[PDB]
Amino acid sequence: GIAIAVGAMVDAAIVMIENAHKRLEEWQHQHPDATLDNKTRWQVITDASVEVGPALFISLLIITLSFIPIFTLEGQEGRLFGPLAFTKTYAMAGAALLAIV
Amino acid sequence: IIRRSVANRFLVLMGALFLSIWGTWTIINTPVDALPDLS
Amino acid sequence: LRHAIEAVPSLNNPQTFSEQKLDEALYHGAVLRVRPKAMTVAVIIAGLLP
């Protein structure tokens, strides 16, 4: 369950990371290079994280919930795919809580 | 919501510095096996 | 692309008989996003390959 969730859970951490780069790419072309501090740099980071943030959270939040139904599985086959569904759901629900905090 | 977490930015690190140390501990302790009991 | 369509051509719609106008936002909605887009599908499939 973990091995499967990994690729999914990192990709939602990066979407913010490749983007902040771009909101730091923006301030470059706009203003002066070789100078910036915390106030402007952490705000552009906070800004970078909030516009495309929730949709990534919802994307991940949409992923975890959508897979849940395989908990519906019964008897023997369910005991098998039980832990696969938990661990996956935890990792997504893990990275999700991680991407925000 | 994200903006609250960044506020107390040290509470998230210290929280995290534990989520990893403690998790690492309960990772090395987690019992092994091949398949969830299926019987 | 739903974002780049509100923002740039939203103001440039009142003109009737003007579709080539809107296509600009769509093209744009596909360029900056590819760097991320490829990169997610990149990992989504990358780490799911082993």
mmCIF file with all atom_site columns, C-alpha atoms in Angstrom:
data_model
loop_
_atom_site.group_PDB
_atom_site.id
_atom_site.type_symbol
_atom_site.label_atom_id
_atom_site.label_alt_id
_atom_site.label_comp_id
_atom_site.label_asym_id
_atom_site.label_entity_id
_atom_site.label_seq_id
_atom_site.pdbx_PDB_ins_code
_atom_site.Cartn_x
_atom_site.Cartn_y
_atom_site.Cartn_z
_atom_site.occupancy
_atom_site.B_iso_or_equiv
_atom_site.pdbx_formal_charge
_atom_site.auth_seq_id
_atom_site.auth_comp_id
_atom_site.auth_asym_id
_atom_site.auth_atom_id
_atom_site.pdbx_PDB_model_num
ATOM 1   C CA . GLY A 1 1   ? 0.000   0.000   0.000   1.00 0.00 ? 1   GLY A CA 1
ATOM 2   C CA . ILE A 1 2   ? 2.912   2.301   0.780   1.00 0.00 ? 2   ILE A CA 1
ATOM 3   C CA . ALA A 1 3   ? 4.872   1.376   -2.348  1.00 0.00 ? 3   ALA A CA 1
ATOM 4   C CA . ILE A 1 4   ? 1.866   2.464   -4.420  1.00 0.00 ? 4   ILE A CA 1
ATOM 5   C CA . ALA A 1 5   ? 1.103   5.691   -2.560  1.00 0.00 ? 5   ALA A CA 1
ATOM 6   C CA . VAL A 1 6   ? 4.682   6.988   -2.725  1.00 0.00 ? 6   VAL A CA 1
ATOM 7   C CA . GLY A 1 7   ? 4.690   8.179   -6.337  1.00 0.00 ? 7   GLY A CA 1
ATOM 8   C CA . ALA A 1 8   ? 1.333   9.825   -5.710  1.00 0.00 ? 8   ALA A CA 1
ATOM 9   C CA . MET A 1 9   ? 2.266   11.485  -2.414  1.00 0.00 ? 9   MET A CA 1
ATOM 10  C CA . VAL A 1 10  ? 5.520   13.067  -3.612  1.00 0.00 ? 10  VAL A CA 1
ATOM 11  C CA . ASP A 1 11  ? 3.968   14.498  -6.779  1.00 0.00 ? 11  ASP A CA 1
ATOM 12  C CA . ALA A 1 12  ? 1.605   16.613  -4.690  1.00 0.00 ? 12  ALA A CA 1
ATOM 13  C CA . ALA A 1 13  ? 4.483   17.947  -2.620  1.00 0.00 ? 13  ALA A CA 1
ATOM 14  C CA . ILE A 1 14  ? 6.415   18.978  -5.726  1.00 0.00 ? 14  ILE A CA 1
ATOM 15  C CA . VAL A 1 15  ? 3.594   20.841  -7.491  1.00 0.00 ? 15  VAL A CA 1
ATOM 16  C CA . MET A 1 16  ? 4.033   23.489  -4.794  1.00 0.00 ? 16  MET A CA 1
ATOM 17  C CA . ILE A 1 17  ? 7.821   23.310  -5.028  1.00 0.00 ? 17  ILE A CA 1
ATOM 18  C CA . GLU A 1 18  ? 8.153   23.733  -8.794  1.00 0.00 ? 18  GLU A CA 1
ATOM 19  C CA . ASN A 1 19  ? 5.646   26.579  -8.542  1.00 0.00 ? 19  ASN A CA 1
ATOM 20  C CA . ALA A 1 20  ? 7.189   28.635  -5.730  1.00 0.00 ? 20  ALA A CA 1
ATOM 21  C CA . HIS A 1 21  ? 10.245  28.523  -7.962  1.00 0.00 ? 21  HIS A CA 1
ATOM 22  C CA . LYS A 1 22  ? 8.030   30.249  -10.511 1.00 0.00 ? 22  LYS A CA 1
ATOM 23  C CA . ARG A 1 23  ? 6.661   32.767  -8.016  1.00 0.00 ? 23  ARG A CA 1
ATOM 24  C CA . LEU A 1 24  ? 10.311  33.411  -7.206  1.00 0.00 ? 24  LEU A CA 1
ATOM 25  C CA . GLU A 1 25  ? 10.966  33.476  -10.934 1.00 0.00 ? 25  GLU A CA 1
ATOM 26  C CA . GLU A 1 26  ? 8.282   36.153  -11.193 1.00 0.00 ? 26  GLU A CA 1
ATOM 27  C CA . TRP A 1 27  ? 9.678   38.483  -8.527  1.00 0.00 ? 27  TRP A CA 1
ATOM 28  C CA . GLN A 1 28  ? 12.966  38.213  -10.408 1.00 0.00 ? 28  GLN A CA 1
ATOM 29  C CA . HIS A 1 29  ? 11.784  39.608  -13.739 1.00 0.00 ? 29  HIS A CA 1
ATOM 30  C CA . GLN A 1 30  ? 9.666   42.174  -11.900 1.00 0.00 ? 30  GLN A CA 1
ATOM 31  C CA . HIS A 1 31  ? 12.015  43.665  -9.314  1.00 0.00 ? 31  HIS A CA 1
ATOM 32  C CA . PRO A 1 32  ? 15.730  43.694  -8.482  1.00 0.00 ? 32  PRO A CA 1
ATOM 33  C CA . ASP A 1 33  ? 17.964  40.623  -8.275  1.00 0.00 ? 33  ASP A CA 1
ATOM 34  C CA . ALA A 1 34  ? 20.631  40.173  -5.589  1.00 0.00 ? 34  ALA A CA 1
ATOM 35  C CA . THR A 1 35  ? 18.294  41.547  -2.912  1.00 0.00 ? 35  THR A CA 1
ATOM 36  C CA . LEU A 1 36  ? 15.275  40.167  -1.017  1.00 0.00 ? 36  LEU A CA 1
ATOM 37  C CA . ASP A 1 37  ? 14.576  39.192  2.593   1.00 0.00 ? 37  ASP A CA 1
ATOM 38  C CA . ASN A 1 38  ? 12.062  37.291  4.747   1.00 0.00 ? 38  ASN A CA 1
ATOM 39  C CA . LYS A 1 39  ? 8.949   39.489  4.554   1.00 0.00 ? 39  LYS A CA 1
ATOM 40  C CA . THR A 1 40  ? 8.752   39.430  0.759   1.00 0.00 ? 40  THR A CA 1
ATOM 41  C CA . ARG A 1 41  ? 10.270  35.964  0.300   1.00 0.00 ? 41  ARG A CA 1
ATOM 42  C CA . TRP A 1 42  ? 8.059   34.159  2.821   1.00 0.00 ? 42  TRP A CA 1
ATOM 43  C CA . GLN A 1 43  ? 4.985   35.978  1.552   1.00 0.00 ? 43  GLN A CA 1
ATOM 44  C CA . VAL A 1 44  ? 5.739   34.965  -2.030  1.00 0.00 ? 44  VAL A CA 1
ATOM 45  C CA . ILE A 1 45  ? 6.193   31.455  -0.622  1.00 0.00 ? 45  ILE A CA 1
ATOM 46  C CA . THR A 1 46  ? 2.920   31.626  1.296   1.00 0.00 ? 46  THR A CA 1
ATOM 47  C CA . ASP A 1 47  ? 1.372   33.067  -1.858  1.00 0.00 ? 47  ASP A CA 1
ATOM 48  C CA . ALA A 1 48  ? 2.938   30.351  -4.001  1.00 0.00 ? 48  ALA A CA 1
ATOM 49  C CA . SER A 1 49  ? 1.501   27.687  -1.699  1.00 0.00 ? 49  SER A CA 1
ATOM 50  C CA . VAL A 1 50  ? -2.092  28.925  -1.384  1.00 0.00 ? 50  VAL A CA 1
ATOM 51  C CA . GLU A 1 51  ? -3.273  29.453  -4.975  1.00 0.00 ? 51  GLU A CA 1
ATOM 52  C CA . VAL A 1 52  ? -2.422  25.964  -6.243  1.00 0.00 ? 52  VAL A CA 1
ATOM 53  C CA . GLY A 1 53  ? -2.348  24.531  -2.718  1.00 0.00 ? 53  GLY A CA 1
ATOM 54  C CA . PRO A 1 54  ? -5.940  23.431  -1.954  1.00 0.00 ? 54  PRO A CA 1
ATOM 55  C CA . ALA A 1 55  ? -6.472  21.875  -5.398  1.00 0.00 ? 55  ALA A CA 1
ATOM 56  C CA . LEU A 1 56  ? -3.473  19.651  -4.702  1.00 0.00 ? 56  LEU A CA 1
ATOM 57  C CA . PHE A 1 57  ? -4.859  18.907  -1.257  1.00 0.00 ? 57  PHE A CA 1
ATOM 58  C CA . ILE A 1 58  ? -8.232  18.142  -2.813  1.00 0.00 ? 58  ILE A CA 1
ATOM 59  C CA . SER A 1 59  ? -6.520  16.118  -5.536  1.00 0.00 ? 59  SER A CA 1
ATOM 60  C CA . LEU A 1 60  ? -4.831  14.023  -2.862  1.00 0.00 ? 60  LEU A CA 1
ATOM 61  C CA . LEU A 1 61  ? -8.002  14.218  -0.778  1.00 0.00 ? 61  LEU A CA 1
ATOM 62  C CA . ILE A 1 62  ? -9.925  13.062  -3.851  1.00 0.00 ? 62  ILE A CA 1
ATOM 63  C CA . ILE A 1 63  ? -7.475  10.189  -4.345  1.00 0.00 ? 63  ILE A CA 1
ATOM 64  C CA . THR A 1 64  ? -7.700  8.700   -0.840  1.00 0.00 ? 64  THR A CA 1
ATOM 65  C CA . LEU A 1 65  ? -11.502 8.802   -0.706  1.00 0.00 ? 65  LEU A CA 1
ATOM 66  C CA . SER A 1 66  ? -12.019 7.389   -4.210  1.00 0.00 ? 66  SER A CA 1
ATOM 67  C CA . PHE A 1 67  ? -10.059 4.226   -3.395  1.00 0.00 ? 67  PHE A CA 1
ATOM 68  C CA . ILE A 1 68  ? -11.935 3.560   -0.140  1.00 0.00 ? 68  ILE A CA 1
ATOM 69  C CA . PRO A 1 69  ? -14.622 1.361   -1.799  1.00 0.00 ? 69  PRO A CA 1
ATOM 70  C CA . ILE A 1 70  ? -12.193 -1.609  -2.000  1.00 0.00 ? 70  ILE A CA 1
ATOM 71  C CA . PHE A 1 71  ? -12.697 -1.816  1.755   1.00 0.00 ? 71  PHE A CA 1
ATOM 72  C CA . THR A 1 72  ? -16.110 -3.052  0.637   1.00 0.00 ? 72  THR A CA 1
ATOM 73  C CA . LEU A 1 73  ? -14.403 -6.294  -0.394  1.00 0.00 ? 73  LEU A CA 1
ATOM 74  C CA . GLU A 1 74  ? -15.618 -9.369  1.465   1.00 0.00 ? 74  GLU A CA 1
ATOM 75  C CA . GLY A 1 75  ? -14.369 -12.609 3.028   1.00 0.00 ? 75  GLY A CA 1
ATOM 76  C CA . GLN A 1 76  ? -10.872 -13.802 2.165   1.00 0.00 ? 76  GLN A CA 1
ATOM 77  C CA . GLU A 1 77  ? -10.159 -11.332 -0.644  1.00 0.00 ? 77  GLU A CA 1
ATOM 78  C CA . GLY A 1 78  ? -10.928 -8.486  1.756   1.00 0.00 ? 78  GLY A CA 1
ATOM 79  C CA . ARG A 1 79  ? -8.470  -9.599  4.424   1.00 0.00 ? 79  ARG A CA 1
ATOM 80  C CA . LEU A 1 80  ? -5.870  -9.456  1.665   1.00 0.00 ? 80  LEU A CA 1
ATOM 81  C CA . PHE A 1 81  ? -6.612  -6.001  0.273   1.00 0.00 ? 81  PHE A CA 1
ATOM 82  C CA . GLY A 1 82  ? -7.520  -4.608  3.686   1.00 0.00 ? 82  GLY A CA 1
ATOM 83  C CA . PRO A 1 83  ? -4.039  -3.435  4.773   1.00 0.00 ? 83  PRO A CA 1
ATOM 84  C CA . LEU A 1 84  ? -3.278  -2.315  1.208   1.00 0.00 ? 84  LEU A CA 1
ATOM 85  C CA . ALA A 1 85  ? -6.175  0.125   1.497   1.00 0.00 ? 85  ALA A CA 1
ATOM 86  C CA . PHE A 1 86  ? -5.301  1.395   4.973   1.00 0.00 ? 86  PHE A CA 1
ATOM 87  C CA . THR A 1 87  ? -1.620  2.104   4.342   1.00 0.00 ? 87  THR A CA 1
ATOM 88  C CA . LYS A 1 88  ? -2.392  3.783   1.015   1.00 0.00 ? 88  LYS A CA 1
ATOM 89  C CA . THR A 1 89  ? -5.058  5.945   2.627   1.00 0.00 ? 89  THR A CA 1
ATOM 90  C CA . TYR A 1 90  ? -2.700  6.845   5.490   1.00 0.00 ? 90  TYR A CA 1
ATOM 91  C CA . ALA A 1 91  ? 0.159   7.829   3.185   1.00 0.00 ? 91  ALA A CA 1
ATOM 92  C CA . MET A 1 92  ? -2.055  10.063  1.068   1.00 0.00 ? 92  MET A CA 1
ATOM 93  C CA . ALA A 1 93  ? -3.727  11.379  4.222   1.00 0.00 ? 93  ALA A CA 1
ATOM 94  C CA . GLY A 1 94  ? -0.162  11.682  5.483   1.00 0.00 ? 94  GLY A CA 1
ATOM 95  C CA . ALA A 1 95  ? 1.426   13.662  2.666   1.00 0.00 ? 95  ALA A CA 1
ATOM 96  C CA . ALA A 1 96  ? -1.746  15.747  2.406   1.00 0.00 ? 96  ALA A CA 1
ATOM 97  C CA . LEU A 1 97  ? -1.431  16.854  6.028   1.00 0.00 ? 97  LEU A CA 1
ATOM 98  C CA . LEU A 1 98  ? 2.289   17.206  5.320   1.00 0.00 ? 98  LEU A CA 1
ATOM 99  C CA . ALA A 1 99  ? 1.903   19.402  2.228   1.00 0.00 ? 99  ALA A CA 1
ATOM 100 C CA . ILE A 1 100 ? -0.083  21.976  4.198   1.00 0.00 ? 100 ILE A CA 1
ATOM 101 C CA . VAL A 1 101 ? 1.843   21.978  7.454   1.00 0.00 ? 101 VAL A CA 1
ATOM 102 C CA . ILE B 2 1   ? -5.441  27.011  7.223   1.00 0.00 ? 1   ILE B CA 1
ATOM 103 C CA . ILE B 2 2   ? -1.915  26.653  5.837   1.00 0.00 ? 2   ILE B CA 1
ATOM 104 C CA . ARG B 2 3   ? -1.137  30.122  7.201   1.00 0.00 ? 3   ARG B CA 1
ATOM 105 C CA . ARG B 2 4   ? -1.784  29.038  10.789  1.00 0.00 ? 4   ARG B CA 1
ATOM 106 C CA . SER B 2 5   ? 0.703   26.173  10.569  1.00 0.00 ? 5   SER B CA 1
ATOM 107 C CA . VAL B 2 6   ? 3.466   28.428  9.216   1.00 0.00 ? 6   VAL B CA 1
ATOM 108 C CA . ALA B 2 7   ? 2.806   30.846  12.082  1.00 0.00 ? 7   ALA B CA 1
ATOM 109 C CA . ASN B 2 8   ? 3.992   28.494  14.806  1.00 0.00 ? 8   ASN B CA 1
ATOM 110 C CA . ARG B 2 9   ? 6.716   27.310  12.432  1.00 0.00 ? 9   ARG B CA 1
ATOM 111 C CA . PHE B 2 10  ? 8.793   25.850  15.255  1.00 0.00 ? 10  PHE B CA 1
ATOM 112 C CA . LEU B 2 11  ? 5.909   23.822  16.672  1.00 0.00 ? 11  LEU B CA 1
ATOM 113 C CA . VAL B 2 12  ? 5.652   22.104  13.294  1.00 0.00 ? 12  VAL B CA 1
ATOM 114 C CA . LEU B 2 13  ? 9.377   21.376  13.112  1.00 0.00 ? 13  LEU B CA 1
ATOM 115 C CA . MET B 2 14  ? 9.630   20.130  16.689  1.00 0.00 ? 14  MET B CA 1
ATOM 116 C CA . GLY B 2 15  ? 6.418   18.249  16.032  1.00 0.00 ? 15  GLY B CA 1
ATOM 117 C CA . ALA B 2 16  ? 8.011   16.916  12.857  1.00 0.00 ? 16  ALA B CA 1
ATOM 118 C CA . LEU B 2 17  ? 11.398  16.215  14.454  1.00 0.00 ? 17  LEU B CA 1
ATOM 119 C CA . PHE B 2 18  ? 9.408   13.863  16.675  1.00 0.00 ? 18  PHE B CA 1
ATOM 120 C CA . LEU B 2 19  ? 7.081   12.430  14.023  1.00 0.00 ? 19  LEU B CA 1
ATOM 121 C CA . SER B 2 20  ? 10.279  11.131  12.423  1.00 0.00 ? 20  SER B CA 1
ATOM 122 C CA . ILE B 2 21  ? 12.261  10.079  15.420  1.00 0.00 ? 21  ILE B CA 1
ATOM 123 C CA . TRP B 2 22  ? 9.259   8.393   17.046  1.00 0.00 ? 22  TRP B CA 1
ATOM 124 C CA . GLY B 2 23  ? 8.022   6.932   13.773  1.00 0.00 ? 23  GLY B CA 1
ATOM 125 C CA . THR B 2 24  ? 11.414  5.663   12.981  1.00 0.00 ? 24  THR B CA 1
ATOM 126 C CA . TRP B 2 25  ? 11.310  3.880   16.314  1.00 0.00 ? 25  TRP B CA 1
ATOM 127 C CA . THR B 2 26  ? 8.019   2.238   15.726  1.00 0.00 ? 26  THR B CA 1
ATOM 128 C CA . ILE B 2 27  ? 9.093   1.332   12.222  1.00 0.00 ? 27  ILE B CA 1
ATOM 129 C CA . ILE B 2 28  ? 12.057  -0.748  13.366  1.00 0.00 ? 28  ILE B CA 1
ATOM 130 C CA . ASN B 2 29  ? 9.729   -2.421  15.877  1.00 0.00 ? 29  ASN B CA 1
ATOM 131 C CA . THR B 2 30  ? 6.786   -3.243  13.596  1.00 0.00 ? 30  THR B CA 1
ATOM 132 C CA . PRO B 2 31  ? 6.340   -7.056  13.416  1.00 0.00 ? 31  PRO B CA 1
ATOM 133 C CA . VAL B 2 32  ? 7.099   -8.830  10.133  1.00 0.00 ? 32  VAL B CA 1
ATOM 134 C CA . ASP B 2 33  ? 4.994   -11.254 8.093   1.00 0.00 ? 33  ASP B CA 1
ATOM 135 C CA . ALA B 2 34  ? 4.164   -12.366 4.548   1.00 0.00 ? 34  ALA B CA 1
ATOM 136 C CA . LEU B 2 35  ? 0.444   -11.812 4.119   1.00 0.00 ? 35  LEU B CA 1
ATOM 137 C CA . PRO B 2 36  ? -2.365  -10.455 6.280   1.00 0.00 ? 36  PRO B CA 1
ATOM 138 C CA . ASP B 2 37  ? -3.868  -13.534 7.845   1.00 0.00 ? 37  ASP B CA 1
ATOM 139 C CA . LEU B 2 38  ? -6.336  -14.561 5.179   1.00 0.00 ? 38  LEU B CA 1
ATOM 140 C CA . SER B 2 39  ? -7.933  -17.549 6.920   1.00 0.00 ? 39  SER B CA 1
ATOM 141 C CA . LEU C 3 1   ? -6.630  26.746  -18.100 1.00 0.00 ? 1   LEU C CA 1
ATOM 142 C CA . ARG C 3 2   ? -9.888  27.757  -16.409 1.00 0.00 ? 2   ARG C CA 1
ATOM 143 C CA . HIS C 3 3   ? -7.727  30.289  -14.586 1.00 0.00 ? 3   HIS C CA 1
ATOM 144 C CA . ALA C 3 4   ? -5.883  31.726  -17.588 1.00 0.00 ? 4   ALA C CA 1
ATOM 145 C CA . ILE C 3 5   ? -9.232  32.030  -19.368 1.00 0.00 ? 5   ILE C CA 1
ATOM 146 C CA . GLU C 3 6   ? -10.869 34.133  -16.731 1.00 0.00 ? 6   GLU C CA 1
ATOM 147 C CA . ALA C 3 7   ? -7.924  36.427  -16.367 1.00 0.00 ? 7   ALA C CA 1
ATOM 148 C CA . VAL C 3 8   ? -6.609  37.368  -19.826 1.00 0.00 ? 8   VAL C CA 1
ATOM 149 C CA . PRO C 3 9   ? -9.332  36.900  -22.471 1.00 0.00 ? 9   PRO C CA 1
ATOM 150 C CA . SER C 3 10  ? -12.237 37.439  -20.058 1.00 0.00 ? 10  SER C CA 1
ATOM 151 C CA . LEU C 3 11  ? -11.889 41.150  -20.792 1.00 0.00 ? 11  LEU C CA 1
ATOM 152 C CA . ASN C 3 12  ? -11.341 40.431  -24.486 1.00 0.00 ? 12  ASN C CA 1
ATOM 153 C CA . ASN C 3 13  ? -14.656 38.686  -25.197 1.00 0.00 ? 13  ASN C CA 1
ATOM 154 C CA . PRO C 3 14  ? -17.177 41.503  -25.905 1.00 0.00 ? 14  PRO C CA 1
ATOM 155 C CA . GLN C 3 15  ? -15.879 41.331  -29.479 1.00 0.00 ? 15  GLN C CA 1
ATOM 156 C CA . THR C 3 16  ? -18.194 39.098  -31.528 1.00 0.00 ? 16  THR C CA 1
ATOM 157 C CA . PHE C 3 17  ? -16.731 36.812  -34.206 1.00 0.00 ? 17  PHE C CA 1
ATOM 158 C CA . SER C 3 18  ? -13.517 36.217  -32.271 1.00 0.00 ? 18  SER C CA 1
ATOM 159 C CA . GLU C 3 19  ? -12.452 32.680  -31.369 1.00 0.00 ? 19  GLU C CA 1
ATOM 160 C CA . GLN C 3 20  ? -8.762  32.854  -32.292 1.00 0.00 ? 20  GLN C CA 1
ATOM 161 C CA . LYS C 3 21  ? -8.689  35.416  -29.481 1.00 0.00 ? 21  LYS C CA 1
ATOM 162 C CA . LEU C 3 22  ? -9.472  32.898  -26.734 1.00 0.00 ? 22  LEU C CA 1
ATOM 163 C CA . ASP C 3 23  ? -7.075  30.210  -27.996 1.00 0.00 ? 23  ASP C CA 1
ATOM 164 C CA . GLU C 3 24  ? -4.213  32.268  -26.546 1.00 0.00 ? 24  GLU C CA 1
ATOM 165 C CA . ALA C 3 25  ? -5.270  31.532  -22.960 1.00 0.00 ? 25  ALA C CA 1
ATOM 166 C CA . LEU C 3 26  ? -5.642  27.842  -23.772 1.00 0.00 ? 26  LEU C CA 1
ATOM 167 C CA . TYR C 3 27  ? -2.170  27.635  -25.310 1.00 0.00 ? 27  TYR C CA 1
ATOM 168 C CA . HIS C 3 28  ? -0.882  29.419  -22.209 1.00 0.00 ? 28  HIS C CA 1
ATOM 169 C CA . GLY C 3 29  ? -2.854  27.129  -19.916 1.00 0.00 ? 29  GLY C CA 1
ATOM 170 C CA . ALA C 3 30  ? -0.689  24.372  -21.356 1.00 0.00 ? 30  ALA C CA 1
ATOM 171 C CA . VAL C 3 31  ? 2.870   25.736  -21.234 1.00 0.00 ? 31  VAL C CA 1
ATOM 172 C CA . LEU C 3 32  ? 3.795   26.704  -17.673 1.00 0.00 ? 32  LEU C CA 1
ATOM 173 C CA . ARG C 3 33  ? 1.814   23.686  -16.486 1.00 0.00 ? 33  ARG C CA 1
ATOM 174 C CA . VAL C 3 34  ? 3.719   21.085  -18.515 1.00 0.00 ? 34  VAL C CA 1
ATOM 175 C CA . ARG C 3 35  ? 6.852   21.504  -16.407 1.00 0.00 ? 35  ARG C CA 1
ATOM 176 C CA . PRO C 3 36  ? 4.701   20.418  -13.445 1.00 0.00 ? 36  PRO C CA 1
ATOM 177 C CA . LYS C 3 37  ? 2.403   18.245  -15.576 1.00 0.00 ? 37  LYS C CA 1
ATOM 178 C CA . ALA C 3 38  ? 5.118   16.078  -17.071 1.00 0.00 ? 38  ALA C CA 1
ATOM 179 C CA . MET C 3 39  ? 6.878   16.014  -13.688 1.00 0.00 ? 39  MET C CA 1
ATOM 180 C CA . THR C 3 40  ? 3.881   14.589  -11.809 1.00 0.00 ? 40  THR C CA 1
ATOM 181 C CA . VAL C 3 41  ? 3.015   11.975  -14.425 1.00 0.00 ? 41  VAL C CA 1
ATOM 182 C CA . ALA C 3 42  ? 6.782   11.550  -14.477 1.00 0.00 ? 42  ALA C CA 1
ATOM 183 C CA . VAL C 3 43  ? 6.900   10.479  -10.822 1.00 0.00 ? 43  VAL C CA 1
ATOM 184 C CA . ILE C 3 44  ? 3.408   8.954   -10.717 1.00 0.00 ? 44  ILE C CA 1
ATOM 185 C CA . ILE C 3 45  ? 4.652   6.473   -13.308 1.00 0.00 ? 45  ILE C CA 1
ATOM 186 C CA . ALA C 3 46  ? 8.321   6.550   -12.306 1.00 0.00 ? 46  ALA C CA 1
ATOM 187 C CA . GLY C 3 47  ? 7.975   5.279   -8.745  1.00 0.00 ? 47  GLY C CA 1
ATOM 188 C CA . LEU C 3 48  ? 5.105   3.015   -9.759  1.00 0.00 ? 48  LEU C CA 1
ATOM 189 C CA . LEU C 3 49  ? 7.395   1.190   -12.189 1.00 0.00 ? 49  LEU C CA 1
ATOM 190 C CA . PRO C 3 50  ? 9.745   -0.673  -9.788  1.00 0.00 ? 50  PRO C CA 1
#
